[PDB]
Amino acid sequence: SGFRKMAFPSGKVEGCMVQVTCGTTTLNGLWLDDVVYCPRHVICTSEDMLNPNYEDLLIRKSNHNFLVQAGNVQLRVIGHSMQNCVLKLKVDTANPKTPKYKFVRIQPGQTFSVLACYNGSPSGVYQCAMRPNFTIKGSFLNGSCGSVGFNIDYDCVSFCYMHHMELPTGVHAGTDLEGNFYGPFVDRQTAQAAGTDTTITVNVLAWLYAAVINGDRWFLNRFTTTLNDFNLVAMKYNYEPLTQDHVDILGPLSAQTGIAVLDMCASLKELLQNGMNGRTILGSALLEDEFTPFDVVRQCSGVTF
Amino acid sequence: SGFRKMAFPSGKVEGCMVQVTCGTTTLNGLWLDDVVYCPRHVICTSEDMLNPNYEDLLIRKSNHNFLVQAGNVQLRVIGHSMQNCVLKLKVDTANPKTPKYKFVRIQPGQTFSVLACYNGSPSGVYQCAMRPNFTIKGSFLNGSCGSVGFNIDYDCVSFCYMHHMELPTGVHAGTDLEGNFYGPFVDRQTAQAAGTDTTITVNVLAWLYAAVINGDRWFLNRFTTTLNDFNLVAMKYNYEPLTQDHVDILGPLSAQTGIAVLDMCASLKELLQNGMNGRTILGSALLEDEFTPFDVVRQCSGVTF
Ligand SMILES: CCN(Cc1ccoc1)C(=O)Cn1nnc2ccccc21
Ligand SMILES: CCN(Cc1ccoc1)C(=O)Cn1nnc2ccccc21
Secondary structure (H helix, E strand, O other), X not given: OOOOOOEOOOHHHHOOEEEEEEOOEEEEEEEEOOEEEEEHHHHOOHHHOOOOOHHHHHHOOOHHHEEEEEOOEEEOEEEEEEEOOEEEEEEOOOOOOOOEEEEOOOOOOOEEEEEEEEOOEEEEEEEEEOOOOOOEOOOOOOOOOOOEEEEEEOOEEEEEEEEEEEOOOOOEEEEOOOOOEOOOOOOOOOOOOOOOOOEOHHXXXXXXXXXXXXXXXXXXXOOOOOHHHHHHHHHHOOEOOOOHXXXXXXXXXXXXXXXXXXXXXXXXXXXXXXXXXXXXXXXXXXXXXXXXXXXXXHHHHOOOO | OOOOOOEXXXXXXXXOEEEEEEOOEEXXXXXXXXXXXXXXXXXXXXXXOOOOOHHHHHXXXXXXXXEEEEOOEEEOEEEEEEEOOXXXXXXXXXXXXXXXXXXXXXXXXXXXXXXEEEOOEXXXXXXXXXXXXXXXXXXXXXXXXXXXXXXXXXXXXXXXXXXXXXXXXXXXXXXXXXXXXXXXXXXXXXXXXXXXXXXXHHHHHHHHHHHHHOOOOOOOOOOOOOHHHHHHHHHHOOEOOOOHHHHHHOHXXXXXXXXXXXXXXXXXXXXXXXXXXXXXXXXXXXXXXXXXXXXXXXHHHOOOO
């Protein structure tokens, strides 16, 4: 028992991290097969960053301008291409450490692990969620660009995120591995509206189930509710609307605990309306929304990779 | 910017995990050089667990009774020895994936990363602290025994924890890698008092510094205090006493922020006496004590391994 904000083991991804240098700029790249993926703003200078013309900047670059280093060994760049906001550098050696992998574009509310890297070397790993407004609340310093987010399913790494930018608000923005930003964001050093964020309701409910499984019981009440009544409350507290698809994905946790989903919604309603009276749930004094129902089932069933 | 509960990258440790089977019992082992380390209770049966006579149980075992498997490959056991509460199985092959490593016995209040494993396969990684009462608040299911805790300093893994037991209270207990339990605990399936726990004061202060560095400012006040006055408050709220050694290790964070340690103590005093009035600090509505001052400096300075 016990419940922790658990990340995926990072070894499969550590073996794919490289350093990419273009001019004075160094950031991280992802080496899979014979391609290295990195943010295209590696080709910018400080004069460039308010509104870089990436096409013009890249035209001035040749294969030999991209310095790619994996630990101590230098990789030979034999082609380069810009896809959306990422650069793809073809190298003459396939990464011997390439795992089975997929590129996926995740949905808001889904979670993933981030391997924070600097100069191609991993620094740490942590779990987070893609916010409903397509930002992430990460821990990134300058030089972390090109760090990636991922999930693992048995032997397959699904890469879903590459880090590009810290907004002036201190939240983080990035792309899928085809270089498409999540959210409205562009790779320019400008103020950029993220728009209203909300709490991921289905994840809060999953975490309340995790709490019950692990012995925090005190918030269970004598009440039930309806999906309409609950969603009127959700709207008032800037929670995402709950759908039947969400109720369905919570089914396994309902079955394990014997607590119907709408009964758990009624417990959440009371917590929203009354707060926690200085109590805690799973070591938290707020309602946690960074565990999906599938995260709770894995951590509670001990799935390995 | 941003601040996360970050674990060390786990790849170096993943390559050391094996499965150890003795009879019907399977748990995890740690393969370093030509020795596999695992909890000695792998040799118990359910009849045994209220008070196992480990010496008598081990005398009935031979090298060929210990089944050790690294992924798909079987290891050949050529010796066995019990050291305190761990078994050391000498194997005929050195682990080709052995990192540079040390065994360390950590102090209460220090933090480390746990690689939770089942059947020798890693499941997830998370950061935690050794409580002042020598328990840990982990996430462990049956079969996780033998999972290890560790820190990394450049290329060297310092192993500090091996998981043995879940107490009836749902908290966790284990040993250093010489098999000595942290705390008063014994490897028997019994109720065992953990004794009074306390909050790790120097870590809470480090985290308040991390908050200031990252822009949470609201709890800073016009006040200061003394070490005596503060420690009278610490005692009332079951916080560890603060010493000058703690003030000294907080020096770098004081210097970075310009906030004297005793001024930050006065902010913490007011939070303890008044609560947070429904506010949050770094995404938390409680005072977080699982970051050491050295954790905060790394995460804020971007150290890699
Ligand atoms: C310098 C590049 N830009 C802006 C940019 C320019 C073009 O496209 C995006 C970043 O925001 C890089 N970045 N990413 N995470 C960070 C965390 C702390 C400090 C900087 C950080
Ligand atoms: C079965 C062995 N014992 C008791 C024991 C017997 C001898 O020495 C210790 C454990 O508590 C194993 N254990 N460790 N973490 C757990 C988490 C959930 C369930 C069981 C768990």
